[PDB]
Structure formats: C-alpha cells, structure tokens
Ligand binder design. Structure first.
Ligand SMILES: NCC(=O)N1CCc2sccc2C1
Ligand SMILES: NCC(=O)N1CCc2sccc2C1
Lengths: 237, 300
C-alpha cells in the first residue's frame, strides 16, 4: 500500500526500490506578450529518480524540445516521466531492477502502472510523506547540468556524496531530507548556512561540502533552526 | 403465446417474470404463467418468503422447448425443467388453463419496455456466459461470481462475461500507453468489437444481460460488467454514430426501469458522472442524461 511514517524503515532494507519525483519535469516561466496577454516559456527540467539505500540519483534531463508542438503539457509530463522510468528499468540488469517504485505524487500512479504492465512483479506505490525532492533544483551542481543541457541526457550522481562511509542509509536519508526541506523553506538562508565558512569546500565529484562529523551536527542543527523559525515567520508563533 | 406451467407452489414465494412480480402463498393453488410473448428471451425468478437471501431464476426462450417449474424439496428451490413429450405438455397446460390456475403475462399493448431491455439479448449468447449445456435454459442467482472476479471460486457456477480491464496489455498497445489509456477507441473498436464480439449487437447483448442480472438478482459482478461496458464506450473518442445513438436508448430504458429504492447500490457514481459530464461522449447521451438528472439528481 501507501508509504508513510509507520513503514519508514522499509526504505533501507535490502529490496531494491526507487523514489520517482516528477515535480521538476515540466518547468515554465510565465510572461506577458506584446499584446498584453500571458504566455509560458518552458525551461529544461528533470526526473528525480533516487535509490534511498545507496544514494544513486538517476537524473534524467528533460530538454524543452520534448514539448514542441505538444498539447496538455502538464498531463504529458506525467506520461513522459513514466516512459523514461520504464525505459530506465528495462535498461538495468534483472538483478538491479527495483522491486518497488514509490512515486511522490499520486497522479504518477496510473501513468507509471500503465508503462510498467510488462513488470507485474514491480510494485508501484504512493506515499503519505511530504518529501522535499522538489528542492533538488536548489542544489547548484544539479541545477547547472539541467540548465546547460542542449539535448536529452541522463546524468548519474550520488546524492549522499561519501556519507555512507561513515553513516547508515537511514541517517543519510534523514540528513538529505533535512537539507532539502531547509532549501525548500528558505533557499537563501539554507545556502548561506552551507557555504558561510570559506574553509569548507565541495569536492569536484560531490554535491555538498566536505563537513566533519562534528561540523555536520552543527550544520544539521542550523538547518532545524531555519525550518522552525520560517515556520514562525510563516505562522507568526 | 406460450406457457410456463408449475407443478405446484409448496413454499411461499415472490415470483417475477421479466419486469413484473407477484406473490404466491404456501400451498396456494398456483399452476403457472400463461400468455408469455413469443419472440423474446424471458426470465422467471424467485425470492422465498422465509429467506430473502438468494434471489435466483432462469433465462429461457419458449421457442427452444417446453419448460415447466417444479419445487425440489431436497435442494429447496423451484427448478426449471424441460418436458420432451410434447403431447403430454399440451395436455397438462390445457387442463390448467381450463381450471384457470395460471396468472397471465400482463403485457400492456402500448408497452415496449421488455423489448427495449432485451433488444440485443439472445439465448445462444446467454448460454455461453452461463455454462450448463445439458439445459436449454440458464440459471443465475445473486451469489454467482464472474470469471474476472475469480481472478481477483467455483468455475462451473461462474458468469463468463467478457473480461474488460483498462490497465492491461490487451487494452494498451506498446508505445501507445498514454494514447490508449486516455482514449480507449483502440480497445473498444479493434480489440473488443472487431476481435471479441464481432459486432455491436453482441456487445449490446452482453451489456443488457449484465444489467438485467444486476437488477433482478442484485448480482454484484454483473453490475460491475454493465458499468465497465458503458465506461469503455464513453471513454472512446471514436465510436460509430449508430452505436452512440443506440447506447443512449438502451441506457434510457434501463434507468427508466430501475427501482428507485435500489438506485443507491446498482448505480456507480463515478462511472455515471464521468460518462455524462467528463468523457468524450458527455454530449452524446441526451435521453440518458435527461432521465438521470430528473430521476436521480442526487447521485449527481
Ligand atoms: N559509487 C557509485 C555511484 O554512486 N554511482 C554510480 C552508479 C549510479 S546509477 C545512478 C547514480 C549512480 C551513482
Ligand atoms: N404485482 C401485482 C400482482 O400481484 N400481479 C401483477 C403482475 C403479475 S404478472 C402475473 C400475475 C401478476 C399479478
């Protein structure tokens, strides 16, 4: 069934699973026309498909050309997402294929289910969690590769950098979701927190700074402050 | 005009014959129904006074044999049987008519309801949905499950309706996933109509049979079949214009005949609101939409 706080440890067991987020697949800017009407201009987007146990982010870049001449784009985006996820699964060796795919928005269930009719034994599931994966385009290196793409392209990232060398996948996912929740509630503050100290750097092959265990506790603490505050500044409490 | 005689009526029972129903008291001197119109299928059905559980009955066509009803005290129900000796049967029926022990099929002459509900229903097709080939007539009751139901437990006693499933490989062409799921014309016109049913008369025949089994026996699997067959047409952007015109008429008379006090269970809100207000054919069912709005504006 659906995924929630009750069955939260299942994410880190040994059954292969992928989260799919489609929030950033169809992205637009809205603007005025010379005639004073309103139009949209599409910009590049991405499918966010993540193995929560390993940190494996399969980032499929959706180039604006995929929309040319198409109608009902927000609906097509969901089916485009499902077609790409199905293609990804088919490209993996049988022993790497997921046993479950969890979608972050329920509108993806039927499109993905239909594209995966050939995989009766892969479970397609929703979730009751409010996962902050939409903030993925607030990660600078991810945003940069999406916006520079001139054609469809799949980019492979580890969203945990090297963390699994020191921490478990439960703790890494918890840190990720904390960082992304912060970025989503106050991007400017979140980012000031992460790069305030010039001496801490991001390795060329990493997404996040190289923080000591001790510096992560301070960082993680600073992110929880932000999320509480901005909830006051937003709820006057 | 043909006759379904009864040997006797040993247990108090409500008897229905097509859309009409009448009560018979325990051991009342009842010997059947006469004046049954030739040229249509018919259904004779039963609800015992003691046990309102299990409505059951028999689909039959008097052109295909001489049939009578006889209570079986071992199995505890009124059983349809065929009499092969034609001279024996005529003589029995003639004696019961002379003593006036049979009620009369009360067909108002202006009344086309039963024709409009069974227009496309054939006994030969009924018999393939209801398998029991040593009999010319077909038993149905409230509890019988459908083939697709058993896929989600006795096959001999199943209703073998055509399985329809919108998220299936039969329904969805590789590479046309979005197209075929949002517009089911392929599945309607090519898979089902051309492939399985051959023509729309056979499709409409199964649809009408499913509704009647839902309405007369409260057969839940039949109600699911009826709604699915409606939904597949309403969800197809491309449907022959004659099929849409006939569908509107079919559904009109089904909605018209439905008991008001059963509409809450026999009608699926989601299907009807989608078919009438969201689907490709939202504008194609004028008679059906008008009677639904005047008779069940609540459901909507
Ligand atoms: N340590 C290897 C690693 O992290 N990878 C490589 C394989 C894949 S597939 C998607 C992302 C990645 C990231
Ligand atoms: N429902 C009233 C009633 O008792 N009726 C009318 C219907 C039929 S059909 C044959 C006899 C009867 C007797």
């Amino acid at each position: 069934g659906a995924m929630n706080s009750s069955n939260y440890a299942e994410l880190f067991n040994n059954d292969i699973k992928l989260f799919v987020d489609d929030t950033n697949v169809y992205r637009v800017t809205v603007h005025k026309t010379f005639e004073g009407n309103v139009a949209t201009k599409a910009i590049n987007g991405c499918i966010f498909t993540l193995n929560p146990k390993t940190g494996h982010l399969f980032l499929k870049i959706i180039h604006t050309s995929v929309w040319a001449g198409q109608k009902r784009l927000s609906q097509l985006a969901k089916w485009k997402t499902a077609e790409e996820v199905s293609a990804l699964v088919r490209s993996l060796p049988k022993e790497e294929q997921p046993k479950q795919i969890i979608v972050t928005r329920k509108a993806m269930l039927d499109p993905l289910e239909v594209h995966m009719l050939d995989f009766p034994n892969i479970a397609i599931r929703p979730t009751e969690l409010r996962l902050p994966f939409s903030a993925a385009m607030s990660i600078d290196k991810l945003s940069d590769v999406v916006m520079k793409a001139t054609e469809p392209q799949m980019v492979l990232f580890n969203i945990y950098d090297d963390w699994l060398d020191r921490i478990s996948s439960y703790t890494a996912f918890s840190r990720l979701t904390l960082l992304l929740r912060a970025l989503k509630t106050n991007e400017e503050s979140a980012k000031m927190i992460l790069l305030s100290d010039p001496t801490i750097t991001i390795k060329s092959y990493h997404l996040w700074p190289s923080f000591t265990d001790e510096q992560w506790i301070t960082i993680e603490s600073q992110m929880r402050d932000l999320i509480l505050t901005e909830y006051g500044r937003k709820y006057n409490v | 005009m043909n006759t379904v005689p009864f040997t006797s009526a040993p247990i108090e029972v409500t008897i229905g014959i097509d859309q009409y129903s009448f009560n018979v008291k325990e051991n009342q001197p009842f010997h059947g129904i006469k004046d049954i119109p030739i040229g249509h299928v018919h259904v004779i059905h039963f609800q015992h006074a003691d046990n309102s559980s299990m409505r059951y009955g028999y689909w039959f066509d008097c052109r295909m044999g001489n049939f009578y009803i006889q209570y079986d005290p071992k199995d505890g129900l009124y059983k349809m049987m065929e009499e092969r000796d034609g001279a024996k049967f005529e003589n029995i029926v003639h004696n019961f008519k002379e003593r006036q022990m049979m009620v009369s099929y009360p067909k108002i002459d202006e009344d086309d309801t039963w024709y409009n509900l069974t227009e496309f229903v054939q006994m030969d097709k009924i018999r393939k949905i209801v398998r029991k080939d040593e009999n010319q007539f077909s038993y149905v009751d409230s509890s019988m499950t459908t083939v697709q139901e058993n896929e989600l437990s006795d096959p001999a006693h199943s209703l073998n309706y055509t399985v329809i499933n919108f998220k299936s490989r039969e329904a969805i062409r590789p590479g046309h996933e979005m197209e075929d799921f949002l517009d089911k014309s392929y599945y309607l016109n090519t898979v089902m109509l051309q492939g399985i049913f051959k023509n729309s008369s056979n499709y409409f025949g199964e649809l009408q049979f499913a509704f009647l089994n839902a309405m007369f026996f409260g057969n839940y699997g039949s109600s699911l079949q009826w709604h699915a067959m409606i939904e597949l047409i309403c969800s197809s952007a491309t449907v022959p214009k004659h099929m849409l015109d006939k569908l509107d008429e079919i559904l009109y008379y089904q909605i018209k005949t439905l008991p008001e006090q059963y509409s809450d269970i026999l009608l699926n809100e989601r299907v009807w609101n989608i078919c009438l207000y969201s689907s490709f054919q939202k504008n194609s069912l004028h008679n059906t939409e008008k009677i639904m709005e005047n008779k069940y504006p609540e459901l909507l």
